UniProtKB/Swiss-Prot annotation:
Identification of the protein by name: Large ribosomal subunit protein uL11
Gene: rpl11
Domain of life of the source: Archaea
Organism expressing this protein natively: Methanocaldococcus jannaschii (strain ATCC 43067 / DSM 2661 / JAL-1 / JCM 10045 / NBRC 100440)
Family: Belongs to the universal ribosomal protein uL11 family.
SMART domains noted in UniProt: RL11
GO CC annotations on file: large ribosomal subunit
Record-linked Pfam families: Ribosomal_L11, Ribosomal_L11_N
Alphabetized InterPro entries for the sequence: Ribosomal_uL11, Ribosomal_uL11_C, Ribosomal_uL11_C_sf, Ribosomal_uL11_CS, Ribosomal_uL11_N, Ribosomal_uL11_N_sf
SUPFAM superfamilies recorded: Ribosomal L11/L12e N-terminal domain, Ribosomal protein L11, C-terminal domain
UniProt KW GTP-binding keyword: no
């Protein structure tokens, strides 16, 4: 058989936990090799949400990795190197946009996609619920909502 896995990892900090482990361990290929190769090819996207595709032949266990690109927002920050508010969105609006992203690209978990929307809002100086989107992300990252 062949299996194609499409996931979103943190550029240069992929681990063998989830989601690579769940998705790949089954296919019985060395998850650590996969993780090494992915971290190699996402060096330049250190810390960014990067889409990745792994293509595996289950019989043979051979695989190959194809890397997408991060959001343009993230590429711009990076290029700028080394604080103003200009609009606000509700969290339900954030979920709306995140649902469109995920419909169009199923490799996104709703969590992933909210993450990215939150990230883009930061990059635009837009608060979510009057709050800083890094703030609001922590609230989510703890496990505190599932009710919006
Ligand atoms: Cl899709």
């Amino acid at each position: 058989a062949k299996e194609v896995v499409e996931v979103l990892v943190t550029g240069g900090r992929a681990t063998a936990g989830p989601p690579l482990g769940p998705a790949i361990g089954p296919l019985g290929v060395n998850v650590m090799q996969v993780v090494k190769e992915i971290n190699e090819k996402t060096k330049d996207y250190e810390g960014m949400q990067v889409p990745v595709k792994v293509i595996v032949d289950t019989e043979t266990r051979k695989f190959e990795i194809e890397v997408g690109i991060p959001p343009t927002t993230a590429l711009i920050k990076k290029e700028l190197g080394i604080h103003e508010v200009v609009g606000n969105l509700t969290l339900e609006q954030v979920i709306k946009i995140a649902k469109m992203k995920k419909d169009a690209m199923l490799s996104y978990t709703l969590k992933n996609a909210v993450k990215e929307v939150l990230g883009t809002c930061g990059s635009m100086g837009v608060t979510v619920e009057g709050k800083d989107p890094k703030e609001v992300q922590k609230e989510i990252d703890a496990g505190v909502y599932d009710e919006y």
